[PDB]
PDB file of C-alpha atoms in Angstrom:
ATOM      1  CA  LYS A   1     163.462 103.887  51.125  1.00 56.73           C
ATOM      2  CA  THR A   2     160.963 101.430  52.513  1.00 56.45           C
ATOM      3  CA  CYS A   3     157.569 101.902  54.088  1.00 56.18           C
ATOM      4  CA  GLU A   4     155.532  99.710  56.463  1.00 55.08           C
ATOM      5  CA  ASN A   5     151.715  99.726  56.266  1.00 56.01           C
ATOM      6  CA  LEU A   6     148.884  97.341  57.024  1.00 54.99           C
ATOM      7  CA  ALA A   7     148.294  94.449  54.679  1.00 58.52           C
ATOM      8  CA  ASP A   8     145.354  95.048  52.424  1.00 57.45           C
ATOM      9  CA  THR A   9     143.526  91.688  52.648  1.00 56.53           C
ATOM     10  CA  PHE A  10     145.102  89.606  55.419  1.00 55.58           C
ATOM     11  CA  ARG A  11     142.338  87.751  57.234  1.00 54.90           C
ATOM     12  CA  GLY A  12     141.843  87.648  61.017  1.00 55.14           C
ATOM     13  CA  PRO A  13     144.309  88.473  63.733  1.00 53.06           C
ATOM     14  CA  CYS A  14     148.012  88.195  63.059  1.00 51.77           C
ATOM     15  CA  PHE A  15     149.474  85.561  65.361  1.00 53.64           C
ATOM     16  CA  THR A  16     152.459  84.315  63.341  1.00 52.04           C
ATOM     17  CA  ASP A  17     155.012  86.349  61.455  1.00 55.93           C
ATOM     18  CA  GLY A  18     155.228  83.540  58.914  1.00 54.82           C
ATOM     19  CA  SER A  19     151.553  83.882  58.028  1.00 56.25           C
ATOM     20  CA  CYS A  20     152.021  87.625  57.448  1.00 57.46           C
ATOM     21  CA  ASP A  21     155.316  87.331  55.598  1.00 55.13           C
ATOM     22  CA  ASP A  22     153.670  84.764  53.319  1.00 55.62           C
ATOM     23  CA  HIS A  23     150.750  87.098  52.651  1.00 56.15           C
ATOM     24  CA  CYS A  24     152.930  90.150  52.034  1.00 55.00           C
ATOM     25  CA  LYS A  25     155.448  88.333  49.791  1.00 53.65           C
ATOM     26  CA  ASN A  26     153.069  86.050  47.897  1.00 52.14           C
ATOM     27  CA  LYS A  27     149.738  87.855  47.784  1.00 53.07           C
ATOM     28  CA  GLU A  28     150.903  91.480  47.676  1.00 50.79           C
ATOM     29  CA  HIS A  29     154.349  90.906  46.084  1.00 49.28           C
ATOM     30  CA  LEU A  30     155.930  93.206  48.651  1.00 50.96           C
ATOM     31  CA  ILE A  31     159.216  92.853  50.496  1.00 49.25           C
ATOM     32  CA  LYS A  32     158.198  91.189  53.763  1.00 49.90           C
ATOM     33  CA  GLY A  33     155.579  91.048  56.448  1.00 50.20           C
ATOM     34  CA  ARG A  34     155.373  90.778  60.205  1.00 49.06           C
ATOM     35  CA  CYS A  35     152.751  90.986  62.915  1.00 47.43           C
ATOM     36  CA  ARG A  36     153.047  94.019  65.143  1.00 45.31           C
ATOM     37  CA  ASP A  37     151.912  94.477  68.752  1.00 43.64           C
ATOM     38  CA  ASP A  38     148.418  95.277  67.438  1.00 41.72           C
ATOM     39  CA  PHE A  39     147.957  91.681  66.246  1.00 41.65           C
ATOM     40  CA  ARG A  40     147.722  92.867  62.646  1.00 45.04           C
ATOM     41  CA  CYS A  41     149.830  92.044  59.602  1.00 47.01           C
ATOM     42  CA  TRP A  42     152.072  94.828  58.306  1.00 48.00           C
ATOM     43  CA  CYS A  43     153.839  94.665  54.985  1.00 45.44           C
ATOM     44  CA  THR A  44     157.064  96.460  54.022  1.00 45.91           C
ATOM     45  CA  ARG A  45     157.389  97.800  50.491  1.00 46.66           C
ATOM     46  CA  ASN A  46     159.755  99.939  48.412  1.00 46.35           C
ATOM     47  CA  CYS A  47     158.503 103.569  48.650  1.00 48.97           C
TER      48      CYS A  47
ATOM     49  CA  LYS B   1     170.505  88.786  46.961  1.00 48.24           C
ATOM     50  CA  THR B   2     168.943  85.916  48.896  1.00 48.52           C
ATOM     51  CA  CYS B   3     165.263  85.345  49.356  1.00 49.26           C
ATOM     52  CA  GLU B   4     163.342  83.359  51.960  1.00 48.47           C
ATOM     53  CA  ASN B   5     159.951  81.897  51.035  1.00 48.13           C
ATOM     54  CA  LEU B   6     157.790  78.848  51.589  1.00 48.48           C
ATOM     55  CA  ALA B   7     159.014  75.417  50.624  1.00 48.97           C
ATOM     56  CA  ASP B   8     157.463  73.728  47.629  1.00 50.39           C
ATOM     57  CA  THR B   9     155.799  70.428  48.493  1.00 50.90           C
ATOM     58  CA  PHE B  10     157.108  70.001  51.996  1.00 49.85           C
ATOM     59  CA  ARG B  11     154.501  67.688  53.418  1.00 51.98           C
ATOM     60  CA  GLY B  12     153.065  68.092  56.862  1.00 51.49           C
ATOM     61  CA  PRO B  13     153.780  70.407  59.743  1.00 49.71           C
ATOM     62  CA  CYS B  14     157.252  71.824  60.244  1.00 51.29           C
ATOM     63  CA  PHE B  15     158.159  70.858  63.804  1.00 51.80           C
ATOM     64  CA  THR B  16     161.842  70.196  63.358  1.00 52.89           C
ATOM     65  CA  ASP B  17     164.162  72.678  61.631  1.00 51.50           C
ATOM     66  CA  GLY B  18     166.475  69.934  60.383  1.00 50.89           C
ATOM     67  CA  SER B  19     163.716  68.258  58.331  1.00 50.14           C
ATOM     68  CA  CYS B  20     163.090  71.563  56.571  1.00 47.73           C
ATOM     69  CA  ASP B  21     166.770  72.284  56.022  1.00 46.09           C
ATOM     70  CA  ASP B  22     167.078  68.801  54.505  1.00 43.65           C
ATOM     71  CA  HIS B  23     164.125  69.366  52.186  1.00 44.35           C
ATOM     72  CA  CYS B  24     165.320  72.772  51.087  1.00 43.91           C
ATOM     73  CA  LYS B  25     168.896  71.656  50.410  1.00 43.16           C
ATOM     74  CA  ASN B  26     168.297  68.155  48.997  1.00 42.12           C
ATOM     75  CA  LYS B  27     164.886  68.227  47.394  1.00 39.09           C
ATOM     76  CA  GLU B  28     164.792  71.838  46.202  1.00 35.85           C
ATOM     77  CA  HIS B  29     168.584  72.350  45.763  1.00 34.53           C
ATOM     78  CA  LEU B  30     168.414  75.637  47.713  1.00 37.10           C
ATOM     79  CA  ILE B  31     170.676  77.100  50.376  1.00 38.12           C
ATOM     80  CA  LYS B  32     169.052  76.154  53.716  1.00 39.52           C
ATOM     81  CA  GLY B  33     165.706  75.905  55.469  1.00 36.95           C
ATOM     82  CA  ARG B  34     164.053  76.429  58.814  1.00 36.62           C
ATOM     83  CA  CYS B  35     160.608  76.025  60.342  1.00 36.39           C
ATOM     84  CA  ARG B  36     158.877  79.277  61.255  1.00 36.28           C
ATOM     85  CA  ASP B  37     156.178  80.243  63.736  1.00 36.12           C
ATOM     86  CA  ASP B  38     153.543  79.250  61.200  1.00 33.47           C
ATOM     87  CA  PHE B  39     154.843  75.656  61.453  1.00 33.49           C
ATOM     88  CA  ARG B  40     155.719  75.735  57.771  1.00 29.16           C
ATOM     89  CA  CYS B  41     159.082  75.072  56.115  1.00 26.99           C
ATOM     90  CA  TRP B  42     160.796  78.112  54.649  1.00 25.46           C
ATOM     91  CA  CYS B  43     163.742  77.855  52.267  1.00 24.43           C
ATOM     92  CA  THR B  44     166.432  80.419  51.515  1.00 26.01           C
ATOM     93  CA  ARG B  45     167.688  80.657  47.941  1.00 27.00           C
ATOM     94  CA  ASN B  46     169.913  82.778  45.761  1.00 29.39           C
ATOM     95  CA  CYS B  47     167.639  85.239  43.881  1.00 28.94           C
TER      96      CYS B  47
END
């Protein structure tokens, strides 16, 4: 099971999925990240 | 498992997928690469 929640410390609006995926993978050590239609970065994690 | 993450020491913006694929395969000895919407080079590797 996996869970999608807001990034903890991503800065500013989320315009690029790459910026969010980078944050989620490399700062939070989670599975992946994407921007959603809210222009925020959401990370997926094992849950 | 495969993993996609940022290239190591790909210089400059990623505006052409083939330049990234080349880097990832030939400089980093990974599977493949592509530019993403962050204009960075992302490599896929066995992990």
